[PDB]
Design a binder for this molecule. Structure first.
Ligand code: CLA
Ligand code: CLA
Ligand code: CLA
Ligand code: CLA
Ligand code: CLA
Ligand code: CLA
Ligand code: CLA
Ligand code: CLA
Ligand code: BCR
Ligand code: PQN
Ligand code: SF4
Ligand code: SF4
Lengths: 37, 39, 31, 728, 65, 81, 74
C-alpha cells in the first residue's frame, strides 16, 4: 500500500534524501554553466 | 693442546682442595649436632 | 673431528637432570 | 507486509516509549545487537546469530562479485596480460567532470583510471583468466548465491527455524567441518589447479597465444594434449589401482624454492601440499565420538590430566565452553588474530602467487593490512574474555580448578610481571638514550654497534645456520632450502631482487627486546583488567555493579577509570605503538638491505644503502634517516596528471588534534555552554523541544580514542603508499 | 597383498578384546565366518592404511612376486 | 572524617540509608511531614567519599549533601595496608 | 633411571611384599625377556650395522632404513 511512507518517513533516510537532492541541485548548475565568473 | 678451552688448566684445585674442605667441615659440624634436629 | 663449545653444551646437560635428580635420590633417606 | 519497521525501540521496552532528550538517540545505536540483554532464552539468540552470519556472507559475495565486474569492464587486465612487467594494473576510471579530470592514471596503452594496489591480477595470473565475459558470469554467480543464502536465512528464521539440541554437538561440528569443509574444498581446488592452472602456466612461458590456448572443455575428455606433457598423464595410467605412484613424478613433485620463470615458487609443490593437507586433516577430523557408539568421550579426557601441582586438573570446563558464548568468541578471536599476524609475518619470504617478489607494491600493503587486523582484533578477543568473566562464571563448578588456582594468587603473578616490564623497559630504552648521549658527547667509542662495545645475538644466527644446510640429510627428498633469507643463493630476476639472505648484526638486539617489552606491558594491562575484574583490593562490588561504568565517586581520593574496558583502552593505545614501530622496522629493513635494483653481476644496489648499521642506533638518526625519505616527495608529490591526488595526510593531522581535544576536557563546561545557547534560542522562540544534553564521559572518551586511531593510521598509510609509489 | 590387511585387521578386532570406547561389538553386524561387526569397517580401513605404509616401506624391493 | 549535611527535604523513602555501605546514617524521629523519621549522620568518622547516597536521594535538590573535608586518615582513606 | 628410582618412593607407587615374593614372573621375564630378546636386538644390530662396517660399508642412523642386510633378503 501507500503505508510505506508512514514507515519510510524516519528523518535519517529523509536527511540523506534531502541532502542528495540539494547536492545534485548544486551539481546541475555547476554542470550546465560552470563558466560564469 | 687441542680444540677445548683452558678448563683442564684450572678446574682441579677446587675439586681437589676446597670441595673436600667444605665437605669435611660440614661433616664435622654435623657429627656434633644438638637434639632432635639436624642438617 | 674434535669438538668446540659443544663440550660446554654437554656439560650444560648435566647439573639439572642428573645433578639434582641424584641429589633427591640421595636426600630421600633422611640424613 | 511492510507495517513494522518504523516502530523503533522494537527490541527494548525502555527506549521504545519516546525520545525525551538527545540521549534517546545515542543508545539506539548502542543496544541493537546484544540481545543477550533482552531475555534469558537461547534458541532465539542462536537463530539471530545464524541470520546475521548469513547476512555477512551475503555482503561478502556482493562486494567480491562487484569488484570482479569492475575488474572486467574498467581494468586493463587483458592488455596487462601479455606484459605483467611494463604495465601497472589499474581500475576505477576517473569520471570526467570538474575536479577529477587530471587524475587519469595512465598506465600505458592509453588506459587511464586509478593505479590500484591489491594484486588481484596476480590471482588472475594463476587462475589463467583470458576473457572478461567468463568473469562477468562469475560475478553473476556470486551475487545470485548471495541473494540465495540471504533468502535461506529469511526462511530458516521465519518459516523453519532449528531447535535447541541442534547447538551443542561440538563433536559432529569438528568432524564435519575439519573433514568435509576443509579437506574437500582443498582437494577440489587442487584438482582445479592440476587440470587448468599449471597447463596455462606452462603456456605462459613464451607468448603461446593466450585466448588461442584451448578451454577446459578441450581437456575434460581430451586427454591427447594432456598426454603431450607428463607421459604418465596419458589418462593417469591409473597406477593407483596398482598402488604404484612412481609414474606420477611428472607433476606431483617436491622442489621447494623460487622458480625464476614465474616470479613465485614452483606451483607443483603447492598442489602436492594441498593434497597432503587434505587427506591429513581428513583422517584427523575423523576423530571424535558420534552416532556410531565409537570415539573419545572428550569431557573425560580433561578429567584425567591432574596431579600434584595441578590441583584437580581441567575438571569442569564444558559448561563454560557451550553454555556461554562470549568465551568461545574471545578465544577464537585471539587465535585468529595470532594466526593472521603470523600469516603477515610469513608471506614475504615464500611468495605463493606469480609475480610477487618482483612486484614491490602489493607486498607491504597486504603485509601491513593483515598485521593491523591481527592485533586490532586480538585485543577484542581479550575484551570478550573479560566480558565473559563479568557475565558468565560459577562459584560451584569452579572449585580449585586450574582456572580458580590463578585467581587466588593473582598478586604474585602481576607483581613479578610489573617487575619484568620495568626491567626490560629501561634496560632497553635507557641503554638506547645512553648511546644517544655518548654520540652527542664526542665519546663515540662508547657506542654499541660492531665498531664499538659488542653484543651479538648468536642464537638467531645459529638457528638460521642449522636451517641453511637442511636438505640432503634432514630433507633428503628435497632440492633447495625452504627460503633464501636463511641461506642459499640470492634468487632474483632482472635488475630486481626477489630474495637474498638477511643479516642480523647488532641493531637487531634492542629492537627485538623493545618488541618484547611492549608486548609484556600490553599483556600486563589486559591481564590486570582480567584478574581484577570482579573484585579489587578496594572495590568489592565491580562484578556486583557492571563492567561499563565511569567511576565510583571521589572516594579514597579518586577512582575514575576503574572499569575494564578502560584497561583495554590503554591496551589498544599500547598495541598501536607496538604495531606502528613493528611496521616501521619491517619496511625500513626490507627497503634498506633486501630491496633495490640489480646489475648483470647480480649486483644488488639497494634503495637506501644499509642505514641501520649507520643510524638506526640513536634517536635523532631515527627521525632523520626515516621520515626524511618517507616524506621528501609527498610535499611535492602533487601537481600533474598522475600526481594530482593530494593526499589527506595534511588532512589527518586535523582530525588528530580534534581527537585529543575530546580527551583532556570534562563535560560540565560543555553542558553550561549548551545551556547558554539554549537561553538565547529560547529568547528568539526557536527552542528545540528535544532538549540537547552533552555527551557522557564514556561516550566522549570513546569518540576521542576513535578519532585518535583514525587520524594516526590514515597518516601512516598515506606515508608509505606515496613512498612506494615513488619507487613502484 | 590384501592378505596381511585382513590378518592385522582380525588380529586387532576379533581374535582379541579391544577396549574400544564403549566396547560395542554390534552397532550393526555382518557375517564372514564369525565376526563382531559395526566397527569392523573402520578397523579394515585403517588396516588398509597400515598396509599402505608397509608396502611403501617395502618400496625398494620385496614381496611382489 | 569529612562532614555531612542534612536538610528538610527528606521525604523519607530511605533509599540513601540502604545505599551507603559505610554505616553513617540513621532515621531519627521527626514530626514535620509524613516522614516522622528523618535521616541523619551519627557516625561520620567512617565516611568514604563515595557519595552513592545522594544519588539514591530522589528529592528535588537531593536532601543530603556531603562537605568533603581535609582531615583524612587511614580510615577515611580506606587502605587494607 | 635415577628419576624412576625416585618415583617408587612416593606413597601411591609402593610395591607389595607379595609382589616381591612371587618368583615365576621374575623368572620368566628375566631368563626370556632380559637377554634372550636382548641378544636378539644385539643380533639385529650385528647384521644391520656390525657386519656392514666390518665389510667397509657405512650405515648411519638414516641410511639403515632403506638398504638391506642381504640381496637375497626376505
Ligand atoms: C561492491 C560494491 C560496489 C561499489 C562500492 C561500487 C562503486 C561504484 N560503481 Mg559499481 N557495481 C557493483 C558494485 C559496486 N559498485 C556491482 C555489483 C555491479 C554489477 C551490477 C556494478 C556495476 C557498475 C557499473 C555498470 C558502473 C558502476 C560504477 C560505479 C562507480 C560510480 C557508481 C555510480 O554512479 O553508479 C553506477 C552508475 C552507472 C551505471 C551509470 C563507483 C566507484 C560506474 C562507474 O563509474 O564505472 C566503474 C558504472 O558505470 N558499477
Ligand atoms: C566536492 C565535490 C565533488 C563531487 C561532487 C565529486 C563527485 C564524484 N567524484 Mg570526486 N573528487 C573531488 C570532488 C568531488 N567529486 C575532489 C576534490 C577530489 C580530489 C582532487 C576528488 C577525487 C576523486 C577520485 C579519485 C574519484 C572521484 C570520483 C567521483 C565520482 C563518484 C564519487 C561520488 O560522487 O561519491 C560516491 C558516489 C557513488 C558511488 C554513486 C563522482 C562523479 C570517482 C570516479 O570518478 O569514479 C567513480 C573516483 O575514483 N573523485
Ligand atoms: C571516491 C572515493 C573512492 C572510492 C569510492 C574508492 C573505491 C575503491 N578503491 Mg580507491 N582510491 C581513492 C578513492 C576512492 N576509492 C583514492 C583517493 C586513492 C588514492 C589515489 C585510491 C587508491 C586505491 C588503490 C591503490 C586501490 C583502490 C581500490 C579500491 C576498490 C576497493 C574497494 C574498497 O576499498 O572497499 C572499501 C570502500 C572504501 C574504502 C570507500 C574500490 C572500488 C583497490 C582496488 O581496486 O582493488 C581491486 C586498490 O588496490 N583505491
Ligand atoms: C561437512 C559439513 C559441513 C560444512 C561444510 C559446514 C560449513 C559451515 N558451517 Mg556448519 N554444521 C554442520 C556441518 C557442516 N557445516 C553440522 C553437521 C552442524 C550441526 C552441529 C553444523 C552447525 C553449524 C553452526 C551452528 C554454524 C555452522 C556454520 C558454518 C559455516 C562457518 C563459516 C565458514 O566456513 O565460512 C566460510 C566462508 C566463506 C566460504 C566465504 C560454514 C559454511 C556457522 C554459520 O552460520 O555459517 C556462517 C554457524 O554458526 N555450522
Ligand atoms: C566478530 C566480531 C565481533 C562481534 C560479533 C562483536 C559483538 C559485540 N561486541 Mg565487540 N569487539 C570486537 C569484535 C566483535 N564484537 C573487537 C575486535 C573489539 C575490539 C576493537 C570489540 C570491542 C568491543 C567493546 C569495547 C564492546 C563490544 C561490545 C559488543 C556487543 C555489543 C555490540 C553492539 O551492539 O554494538 C552497538 C554499538 C555500535 C555498533 C557502535 C556485541 C555482542 C560491547 C558490549 O560489551 O556489549 C555486550 C562493548 O562495550 N565490543
Ligand atoms: C613520554 C612517554 C612515555 C614514557 C616515557 C612512559 C613511561 C612509562 N610508562 Mg607510560 N604511557 C604514556 C607515555 C609514556 N610512558 C602514555 C601517553 C600513555 C597513555 C596511552 C601511557 C600509559 C601507560 C600505562 C597504562 C602503563 C605505563 C607504564 C609505563 C612505565 C613502563 C616502565 C618503564 O620502562 O619505565 C621507563 C623508564 C624510563 C624511560 C627511564 C614507564 C614509567 C606501565 C607501567 O607501570 O610499567 C611498570 C603501565 O602500566 N604507561
Ligand atoms: C571404498 C573403496 C574401497 C573398499 C571398499 C576397499 C575394500 C577392500 N580392499 Mg581396497 N583399495 C582401495 C579402496 C577400497 N578398498 C583403494 C583406493 C585402493 C588403491 C590405493 C585399494 C587397493 C587395494 C588392494 C591392492 C587390495 C585391496 C583389497 C581390499 C579388500 C581386503 C579384504 C578385506 O579386508 O575385506 C577389501 C574388501 C585387497 C587387495 O589386495 N584394496
Ligand atoms: C615397516 C616398514 C616401513 C619402512 C621400511 C618405512 C620406511 C620409511 N618411511 Mg614409513 N611407514 C610405515 C612403515 C615403514 N616405513 C607405516 C606402517 C606407516 C604408517 C601407515 C608409515 C608412514 C610413513 C610416513 C607418513 C612417512 C614415512 C617415511 C619413511 C621414510 C623415512 C624418512 C624419514 O625419516 O622421514 C622411510 C623410507 C617418511 C618419508 O620421508 O617418506 C617419504 C614419511 O613422511 N613412512
Ligand atoms: C580467507 C579470506 C577469504 C577467502 C575465503 C576462502 C577462499 C574460502 C574457501 C572456501 C572453499 C575453498 C570452500 C570449498 C568448499 C567445498 C566443499 C565443502 C566441497 C564439498 C564436496 C562435497 C560435499 C562433495 C559432494 C559429492 C559430489 C559433488 C559428487 C557425488 C559425491 C559427493 C556427494 C561426495 C575472503 C576473501 C572471503 C575474505 C578474507 C579472508
Ligand atoms: C564537544 C564535546 C561535547 C559537546 C557535546 C555534544 C553532544 C556535541 C555534539 C554536537 C553534535 C551532536 C555533533 C553533530 C555532528 C554532525 C557533523 C553535525 C551535523 C548536523 C547538521 C548536518 C544537521 C561534550 O559534551 C563532551 C563531554 C565530555 C568530554 C568531551 C566533550 C566534548 O569534547
Ligand atoms: S535523603 Fe533521600 S533516602 Fe534519605 S530519607 Fe530523605 S528522601 Fe529518603
Ligand atoms: S561517601 Fe556518601 S555514602 Fe559513603 S559514607 Fe560518605 S555520605 Fe555515606
Amino acid at each position: 500500500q501507500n503505508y510505506l511512507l508512514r514507515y519510510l518517513s524516519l528523518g535519517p533516510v529523509l536527511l540523506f534524501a534531502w541532502l542528495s537532492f540539494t547536492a545534485v541541485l548544486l551539481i546541475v548548475f555547476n554542470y550546465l554553466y560552470p563558466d560564469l565568473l | 693442546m687441542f680444540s677445548a678451552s683452558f678448563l683442564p688448566s684450572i678446574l682441579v684445585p677446587l675439586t681437589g682442595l676446597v670441595f673436600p674442605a667444605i665437605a669435611m667441615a660440614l661433616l664435622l659440624i654435623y657429627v656434633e649436632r644438638e637434639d632432635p634436629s639436624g642438617i | 673431528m674434535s669438538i668446540s663449545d659443544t663440550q660446554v653444551f654437554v656439560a650444560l646437560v648435566i647439573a639439572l637432570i642428573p645433578g639434582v635428580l641424584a641429589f633427591r635420590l640421595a636426600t630421600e633417606l633422611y640424613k | 507486509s511492510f507495517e513494522k519497521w518504523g516502530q523503533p525501540g522494537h527490541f527494548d521496552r525502555t527506549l521504545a516509549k519516546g525520545p525525551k532528550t538527545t540521549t534517546w538517540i545515542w543508545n539506539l545505536h548502542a543496544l541493537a545487537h546484544d540481545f543477550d540483554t533482552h531475555t534469558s532464552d537461547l534458541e532465539d539468540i542462536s537463530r539471530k546469530i545464524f541470520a546475521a552470519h548469513f547476512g555477512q556472507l551475503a555482503v561478502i559475495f556482493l562486494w567480491l562479485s562487484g569488484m570482479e565486474f569492475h575488474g572486467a569492464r574498467f581494468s586493463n587486465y587483458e592488455a596487462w596480460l601479455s606484459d605483467p612487467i611494463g604495465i601497472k594494473p589499474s581500475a576505477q576510471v576517473v569520471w570526467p567532470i570538474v575536479g577529477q579530470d587530471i587524475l587519469n592514471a595512465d598506465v600505458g596503452g592509453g588506459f587511464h583510471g586509478i593505479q590500484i594496489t591489491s594484486g588481484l591480477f596476480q590471482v588472475w595470473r594463476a587462475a589463467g583468466f583470458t576473457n572478461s565475459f567468463q568473469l562477468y558470469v562469475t560475478a553473476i554467480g556470486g551475487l545470485v548465491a548471495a541473494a540465495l543464502m540471504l533468502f535461506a536465512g529469511w526462511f530458516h528464521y521465519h518459516k523453519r527455524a532449528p531447535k535447541l539440541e541442534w547447538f551443542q554437538n561440538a563433536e559432529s561440528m569438528l568432524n564435519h567441518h575439519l573433514a568435509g569443509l576443509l579437506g574437500l574444498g582443498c582437494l577440489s581446488w587442487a584438482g582445479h589447479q592440476i587440470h587448468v592452472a599449471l597447463p596455462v602456466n606452462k603456456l605462459l612461458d613464451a607468448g603461446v597465444a593466450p585466448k588461442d590456448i584451448p578451454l577446459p572443455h578441450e581437456f575434460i575428455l581430451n586427454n591427447s594434449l594432456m598426454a603431450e606433457l607428463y607421459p604418465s598423464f596419458a589418462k593417469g595410467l591409473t597406477p593407483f589401482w596398482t598402488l604404484n605412484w612412481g609414474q606420477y613424478a611428472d607433476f606431483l613433485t617436491f622442489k621447494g624454492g623460487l622458480n625464476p620463470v614465474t616470479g613465485g615458487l614452483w606451483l607443483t609443490d603447492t598442489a602436492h601440499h594441498h593434497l597432503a593437507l587434505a587427506v591429513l586433516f581428513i583422517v584427523a577430523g575423523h576423530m571424535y565420538r558420534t552416532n556410531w557408539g565409537i570415539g573419545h568421550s572428550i569431557k573425560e579426557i580433561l578429567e584425567n590430566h591432574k596431579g600434584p601441582f595441578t590441583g584437580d586438573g581441567h575438571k569442569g570446563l564444558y559448561e563454560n565452553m557451550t553454555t556461554s558464548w562470549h568465551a568461545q568468541l574471545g578465544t577464537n578471536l585471539a587465535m585468529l588474530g595470532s594466526l593472521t599476524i603470523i600469516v603477515a609475518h610469513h608471506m614475504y619470504a615464500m611468495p605463493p602467487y606469480p609475480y610477487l617478489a618482483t612486484d614491490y607494491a602489493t607486498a607491504l600493503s597486504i603485509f601491513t593490512h593483515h598485521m593491523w587486523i591481527g592485533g586490532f582484533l586480538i585485543v577484542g578477543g581479550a575484551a570478550h574474555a573479560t566480558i565473559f568473566m563479568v557475565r558468565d562464571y560459577d562459584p560451584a563448578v569452579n572449585q580449585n580448578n586450574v582456572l580458580d588456582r590463578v585467581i587466588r594468587h593473582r598478586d604474585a603473578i602481576i607483581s613479578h610481571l610489573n617487575w619484568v616490564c620495568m626491567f626490560l623497559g629501561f634496560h632497553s630504552f635507557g641503554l638506547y638514550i645512553h648511546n644517544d648521549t655518548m654520540q652527542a658527547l664526542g665519546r663515540p667509542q662508547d657506542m654499541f654497534s660492531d665498531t664499538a662495545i659488542q653484543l651479538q645475538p648468536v642464537f638467531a644466527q645459529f638457528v638460521q645456520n642449522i636451517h641453511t644446510l637442511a636438505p640432503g640429510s634432514t630433507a633428503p627428498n628435497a632440492l633447495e632450502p625452504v627460503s633464501y633469507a636463511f641461506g642459499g643463493g640470492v634468487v632474483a630476476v632482472g635488475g630486481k631482487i626477489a630474495m637474498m639472505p638477511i643479516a642480523l648484526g647488532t641493531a637487531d638486539f634492542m629492537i627485538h627486546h623493545i618488541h618484547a617489552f611492549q608486548i609484556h606491558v600490553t599483556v600486563l594491562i589486559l591481564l590486570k583488567g582480567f584478574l581484577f575484574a570482579r573484585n579489587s583490593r578496594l572495590i568489592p562490588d565491580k562484578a556486583n555493579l557492571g563492567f561499563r561504568f565511569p567511576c565510583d565517586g571521589p572516594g579514597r581520593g579518586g577512582t575514575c577509570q576503574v572499569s575494564g574496558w578502560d584497561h583495554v583502552f590503554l591496551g589498544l593505545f599500547w598495541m598501536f605503538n607496538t604495531i606502528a614501530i613493528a611496521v616501521y622496522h619491517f619496511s625500513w629493513k626490507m627497503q634498506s638491505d633486501v630491496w633495490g635494483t640489480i646489475d648483470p653481476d647480480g649486483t644488488i644496489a639497494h634503495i637506501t644503502g644499509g642505514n641501520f648499521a649507520m643510524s638506526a642506533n640513536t634517536i635523532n638518526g631515527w627521525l632523520r634517516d626515516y621520515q626524511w625519505a618517507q616524506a621528501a616527495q609527498v610535499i611535492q608529490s602533487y601537481g600533474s596528471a598522475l600526481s594530482a591526488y593530494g593526499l589527506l595526510f595534511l588532512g589527518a593531522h586535523f582530525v588528530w588534534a580534534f581527537s585529543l581535544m575530546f580527551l583532556f576536557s570534562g563535560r560540565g563546561y560543555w553542558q553550561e555552554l549548551i545551556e547558554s545557547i539554549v537561553w538565547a534560542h529560547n529568547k528568539l522562540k526557536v527552542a528545540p523541544t528535544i532538549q540537547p544534553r552533552a555527551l557522557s564521559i564514556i561516550q566522549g572518551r570513546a569518540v576521542g580514542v576513535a578519532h585518535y586511531l583514525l587520524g594516526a593510521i590514515v597518516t601512516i598509510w598515506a606515508f608509505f603508499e606515496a613512498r612506494i609509489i615513488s619507487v613502484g | 597383498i590384501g592378505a596381511s590387511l585382513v590378518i592385522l585387521f582380525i588380529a586387532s578386532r576379533t581374535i582379541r578384546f579391544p577396549q574400544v570406547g564403549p566396547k560395542m561389538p554390534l552397532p550393526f553386524p555382518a557375517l564372514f565366518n564369525n565376526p563382531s561387526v559395526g566397527t569392523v569397517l573402520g578397523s579394515v580401513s585403517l588396516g588398509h592404511i597400515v598396509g599402505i605404509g608397509i608396502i611403501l616401506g617395502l618400496n625398494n624391493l620385496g614381496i611382489l612376486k | 572524617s569529612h562532614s555531612v549535611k542534612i536538610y528538610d527535604t527528606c521525604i523519607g523513602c530511605t533509599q540513601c540509608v540502604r545505599a551507603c555501605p559505610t554505616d553513617v546514617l540513621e532515621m531519627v524521629p521527626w514530626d514535620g511531614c509524613k516522614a516522622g523519621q528523618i535521616a541523619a549522620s551519627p557516625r561520620t568518622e567512617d565516611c568514604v567519599g563515595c557519595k552513592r547516597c545522594e544519588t539514591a536521594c530522589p528529592t528535588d535538590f537531593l536532601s543530603i549533601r556531603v562537605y568533603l573535608s581535609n582531615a583524612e586518615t587511614t580510615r577515611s582513606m580506606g587502605l587494607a595496608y | 633411571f635415577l628419576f624412576a628410582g625416585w618415583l617408587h618412593l612416593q606413597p601411591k607407587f609402593r610395591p607389595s611384599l607379595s609382589w616381591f615374593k612371587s618368583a615365576e614372573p621374575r623368572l620368566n621375564h628375566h631368563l626370556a625377556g632380559l637377554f634372550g630378546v636382548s641378544s636378539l636386538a644385539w643380533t639385529g644390530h650385528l647384521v644391520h650395522v656390525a657386519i656392514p662396517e666390518s665389510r667397509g660399508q657405512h650405515v648411519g642412523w638414516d641410511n639403515f632404513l632403506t638398504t638391506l642386510p642381504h640381496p637375497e633378503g626376505l
